[PDB]
Write an enzyme that holds these catalytic residues in place. Structure first.
Site, PDB file in Angstrom:
ATOM      1  N   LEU B  22       2.435   3.153  -0.209  1.00 34.62           N
ATOM      2  CA  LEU B  22       0.983   3.107  -0.230  1.00 34.62           C
ATOM      3  C   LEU B  22       0.384   2.723   1.102  1.00 34.62           C
ATOM      4  O   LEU B  22      -0.767   3.034   1.356  1.00 34.62           O
ATOM      5  CB  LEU B  22       0.490   2.138  -1.314  1.00 34.62           C
ATOM      6  CG  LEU B  22       0.780   2.568  -2.759  1.00 34.62           C
ATOM      7  CD1 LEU B  22       0.687   1.430  -3.704  1.00 34.62           C
ATOM      8  CD2 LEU B  22      -0.197   3.567  -3.156  1.00 34.62           C
ATOM      9  N   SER B  24       1.195   0.880   5.418  1.00 33.32           N
ATOM     10  CA  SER B  24       2.141   0.544   6.505  1.00 33.32           C
ATOM     11  C   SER B  24       1.554  -0.075   7.765  1.00 33.32           C
ATOM     12  O   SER B  24       2.290  -0.772   8.508  1.00 33.32           O
ATOM     13  CB  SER B  24       2.961   1.756   6.885  1.00 33.32           C
ATOM     14  OG  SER B  24       4.308   1.465   6.616  1.00 33.32           O
ATOM     15  N   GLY B  25       2.500  -4.130   6.251  1.00 33.49           N
ATOM     16  CA  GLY B  25       3.872  -3.901   6.754  1.00 33.49           C
ATOM     17  C   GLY B  25       4.744  -3.050   5.815  1.00 33.49           C
ATOM     18  O   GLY B  25       5.955  -3.018   5.973  1.00 33.49           O
ATOM     19  N   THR B  26       4.123  -2.401   4.819  1.00 31.95           N
ATOM     20  CA  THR B  26       4.756  -1.478   3.830  1.00 31.95           C
ATOM     21  C   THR B  26       4.621  -1.930   2.362  1.00 31.95           C
ATOM     22  O   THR B  26       5.420  -2.731   1.883  1.00 31.95           O
ATOM     23  CB  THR B  26       6.236  -1.118   4.138  1.00 31.95           C
ATOM     24  OG1 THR B  26       6.673  -0.002   3.309  1.00 31.95           O
ATOM     25  CG2 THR B  26       7.118  -2.334   3.903  1.00 31.95           C
ATOM     26  N   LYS B  46       4.958  -5.487  -1.972  1.00 30.33           N
ATOM     27  CA  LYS B  46       4.830  -5.732  -0.540  1.00 30.33           C
ATOM     28  C   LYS B  46       6.166  -6.251   0.070  1.00 30.33           C
ATOM     29  O   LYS B  46       6.750  -7.247  -0.414  1.00 30.33           O
ATOM     30  CB  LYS B  46       3.707  -6.698  -0.252  1.00 30.33           C
ATOM     31  CG  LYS B  46       3.317  -6.733   1.225  1.00 30.33           C
ATOM     32  CD  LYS B  46       2.250  -7.756   1.394  1.00 30.33           C
ATOM     33  CE  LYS B  46       1.460  -7.468   2.629  1.00 30.33           C
ATOM     34  NZ  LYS B  46       0.441  -8.580   2.787  1.00 30.33           N
ATOM     35  N   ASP B 133     -12.052 -15.385   2.303  1.00 21.52           N
ATOM     36  CA  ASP B 133     -12.042 -14.005   2.780  1.00 21.52           C
ATOM     37  C   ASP B 133     -12.626 -12.994   1.765  1.00 21.52           C
ATOM     38  O   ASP B 133     -12.039 -11.895   1.570  1.00 21.52           O
ATOM     39  CB  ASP B 133     -10.640 -13.583   3.194  1.00 21.52           C
ATOM     40  CG  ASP B 133     -10.638 -12.291   4.059  1.00 21.52           C
ATOM     41  OD1 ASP B 133     -11.698 -11.815   4.526  1.00 21.52           O
ATOM     42  OD2 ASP B 133      -9.553 -11.752   4.311  1.00 21.52           O
TER      43      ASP B 133
HETATM   44  C1  LIG Z   1      -3.310   2.890  -5.237  1.00 14.24           C
HETATM   45  O1  LIG Z   1      -3.752   2.151  -4.072  1.00 14.24           O
HETATM   46  C2  LIG Z   1      -3.359   0.844  -3.954  1.00 14.24           C
HETATM   47  C3  LIG Z   1      -3.123   0.082  -5.090  1.00 14.24           C
HETATM   48  C4  LIG Z   1      -2.691  -1.222  -4.987  1.00 14.24           C
HETATM   49  N1  LIG Z   1      -2.442  -1.913  -6.113  1.00 14.24           N
HETATM   50  C5  LIG Z   1      -2.088  -3.190  -6.072  1.00 14.24           C
HETATM   51  N2  LIG Z   1      -1.929  -3.790  -4.894  1.00 14.24           N
HETATM   52  C6  LIG Z   1      -2.126  -3.145  -3.724  1.00 14.24           C
HETATM   53  N3  LIG Z   1      -1.957  -3.786  -2.555  1.00 14.24           N
HETATM   54  C7  LIG Z   1      -1.208  -4.905  -2.313  1.00 14.24           C
HETATM   55  C8  LIG Z   1      -1.633  -5.797  -1.325  1.00 14.24           C
HETATM   56  C9  LIG Z   1      -0.891  -6.933  -1.072  1.00 14.24           C
HETATM   57  C10 LIG Z   1       0.298  -7.166  -1.786  1.00 14.24           C
HETATM   58  F1  LIG Z   1       1.087  -8.251  -1.585  1.00 14.24           F
HETATM   59  C11 LIG Z   1       0.737  -6.286  -2.721  1.00 14.24           C
HETATM   60 CL1  LIG Z   1       2.277  -6.698  -3.536  1.00 14.24          CL
HETATM   61  C12 LIG Z   1      -0.005  -5.141  -2.981  1.00 14.24           C
HETATM   62  C13 LIG Z   1      -2.526  -1.813  -3.740  1.00 14.24           C
HETATM   63  C14 LIG Z   1      -2.790  -1.079  -2.585  1.00 14.24           C
HETATM   64  C15 LIG Z   1      -3.212   0.267  -2.707  1.00 14.24           C
HETATM   65  O2  LIG Z   1      -3.478   1.098  -1.648  1.00 14.24           O
HETATM   66  C16 LIG Z   1      -3.497   0.680  -0.269  1.00 14.24           C
HETATM   67  C17 LIG Z   1      -4.681   1.328   0.457  1.00 14.24           C
HETATM   68  C18 LIG Z   1      -4.561   2.857   0.532  1.00 14.24           C
HETATM   69  N4  LIG Z   1      -5.146   3.205   1.818  1.00 14.24           N
HETATM   70  C19 LIG Z   1      -4.504   2.677   3.057  1.00 14.24           C
HETATM   71  C20 LIG Z   1      -4.499   3.744   4.166  1.00 14.24           C
HETATM   72  O3  LIG Z   1      -5.577   4.710   4.043  1.00 14.24           O
HETATM   73  C21 LIG Z   1      -6.739   4.313   3.288  1.00 14.24           C
HETATM   74  C22 LIG Z   1      -6.356   4.055   1.819  1.00 14.24           C
END
Ligand SMILES: COc1cc2ncnc(Nc3ccc(F)c(Cl)c3)c2cc1OCCCN1CCOCC1
Ligand SMILES: COc1cc2ncnc(Nc3ccc(F)c(Cl)c3)c2cc1OCCCN1CCOCC1
Lengths: 299, 299
Positions: B22, B24, B25-26, B46, B133
């Site tokens: 999803l 990228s 630290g990934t 994450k 934040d």
């Molecule tokens: C389906 O989309 C997401 C669902 C998510 N669901 C739960 N958590 C997310 N982020 C997240 C953030 C911090 C963490 F520790 C963990 Cl384990 C997960 C998520 C991040 C997600 O997407 C990241 C952002 C997608 N982008 C990033 C690049 O381009 C613009 C749109």
């Protein structure tokens, strides 16, 4: 680095009386009546060319350490069978003590023991000594408020700019070991930190066996699968989080002993905030004039 | 005050499959198939001693919160590289979501998101947690009717009778900050209220940048000059007035979260009275049997 100028004291066999047996290659409770010093010191006395070699390497290490939270060697006796004379720790080892007294241990003591053990370990680290066998079985109880690290049998004084110890092949306690140590037999103060984490876990569960019923060969794979010991019922997440930090695969990511002193002290100063134990506020734990404890006997 | 008895769950690496990347630290989208529990849970995963320290402080905070409008941590994995496992939020963060779907967002949803976010924030306030934040980028979208507050990276659990948090020196988001926070680095629930105001403004302008093209150093002086973000076109004066109250220099004069719930609820119950949006009444937003959302997975 610096010259080791510890003194090794050789005692005359007639200077000490064995009183009762404590264990059996045979430890006695007894008294040490040095010189004509008008003192009597309670002591524990431990009584094959490999065996003698080992025991003197131990005496060597215990002779070189001096700290309120590390065991105190008083001397050796070179009788046909070599004797080690140490400070008597009347309450025995801390594993049996938490096992035998669970209904009576409050949060204050649990947290104090963690601080004291981290102090001893920080002191060993300063002396560039890696213990390699930290476990609750290797902690002695002078009084319920005063514990000391013992069992220097696997310990290693690091020479030079040696940053780690690479061990050869012996029987080694797997359930208390850092994963680098199990996989590659490397030992640092950072791997002592891991054993510290397990030791705290044994204290927090009142003496229960880590990974009970799992055989030692599996331990490696479990750990790399990311599994750890489970959160003890009495522990708040504050205290557990510290255990888990001690168990990071990245050794440098694990806390330092000096940091463990700080964290556990902060908590010891408000114990019921960090350990939740039922009934906590309610829990408390012949010719003899010349008796003096080893800690008061400085020569 | 009270002991934090949250549980921190440690997951086995083999209990979860990463599906797609999803970010990228990934971060991965993936599935968590605990134990032999006949459930599969959609999750986000994450995956430098400073870095590991930070991430576990976060896991610490997320582990200690439990509310329908705050993100849900399922556990951590202590693999060489530490993994955080959280509830998957399929629609991503709310900033991108209002950016990508503006022609389709009605007043009902805008006002519901404001109520839900104030509920989450009121719950954090009850837990004596200051978020520090809050911004639309830190709000995740489980479904278009259900959002949760995330990103606990700067968050602080207040101890004792600590009434504020005095921060040290890091990179901190200026455009969402209360003026006390910018000038003196003081943080209260009342300064979260200010960020709430900015967050609502980002929602009301469908994702536009606050103080676009102004550099962060000027922000202090503008604010004390008495200037604020401008009234978004869709907003009636009712809704704007609430933003502006969130931006009073006197922190205690700003509304409380619990009051923000009430105000936005009153409005959510007649949405077209309070937001005027063109086309409002016309806008709507494999092996899989054992799929269960984290919210339904209680252990
Ligand atoms: C389906 O989309 C997401 C669902 C998510 N669901 C739960 N958590 C997310 N982020 C997240 C953030 C911090 C963490 F520790 C963990 Cl384990 C997960 C998520 C991040 C997600 O997407 C990241 C952002 C997608 N982008 C990033 C690049 O381009 C613009 C749109
Ligand atoms: C009062 O109890 C002890 C005090 C001790 N105080 C100081 N040192 C001890 N052990 C010890 C260990 C190694 C040594 F080289 C020397 Cl000199 C002494 C001690 C061992 C002690 O007890 C041994 C364990 C008693 N057991 C063993 C059998 O059943 C379970 C409980």
């Amino acid at each position: 680095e610096a010259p080791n100028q510890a003194l090794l004291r050789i005692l005359k066999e007639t200077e000490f009386k064995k009183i009762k047996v404590l264990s059996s290659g045979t430890v006695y409770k007894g008294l040490w009546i040095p010189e004509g010093e008008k003192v009597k010191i309670p002591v524990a006395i431990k009584e094959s060319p490999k065996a003698n070699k080992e025991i003197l390497d131990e005496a060597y290490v215990m002779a070189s350490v001096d700290n309120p939270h590390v065991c105190r060697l008083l001397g050796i006796c070179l009788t046909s069978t070599v004797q080690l004379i140490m400070q008597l720790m009347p309450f025995g080892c801390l594993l049996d003590y938490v096992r035998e007294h669970k209904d009576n241990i409050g949060s204050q003591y649990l947290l104090n023991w963690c601080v004291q053990i981290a102090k001893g370990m920080n002191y060993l680290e300063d002396r560039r000594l890696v213990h390699r066998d930290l476990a609750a079985r290797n902690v002695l109880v002078k009084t319920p408020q005063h514990v000391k690290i013992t069992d220097f049998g696997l310990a290693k004084l690091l020479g030079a700019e040696e940053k780690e110890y690479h061990a050869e092949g012996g029987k080694v306690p797997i359930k208390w070991m850092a994963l680098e140590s199990i996989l590659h037999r490397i030992y640092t103060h950072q791997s002592d930190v891991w054993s510290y984490g397990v030791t705290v876990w044994e204290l927090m569960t009142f003496g229960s066996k880590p990974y009970d019923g799992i055989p030692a060969s599996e331990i490696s794979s479990i750990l790399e699968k990311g599994e750890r010991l489970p959160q003890p019922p009495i522990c708040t997440i504050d205290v557990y989080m510290i255990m888990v930090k001690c168990w990071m695969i990245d050794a440098d990511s694990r806390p330092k002993f000096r940091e463990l002193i700080i964290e556990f002290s902060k908590m010891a100063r408000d114990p019921q905030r960090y350990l939740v134990i039922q009934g906590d506020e309610r829990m408390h734990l012949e010719d003899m004039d010349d008796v003096v404890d080893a800690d008061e006997y400085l020569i």
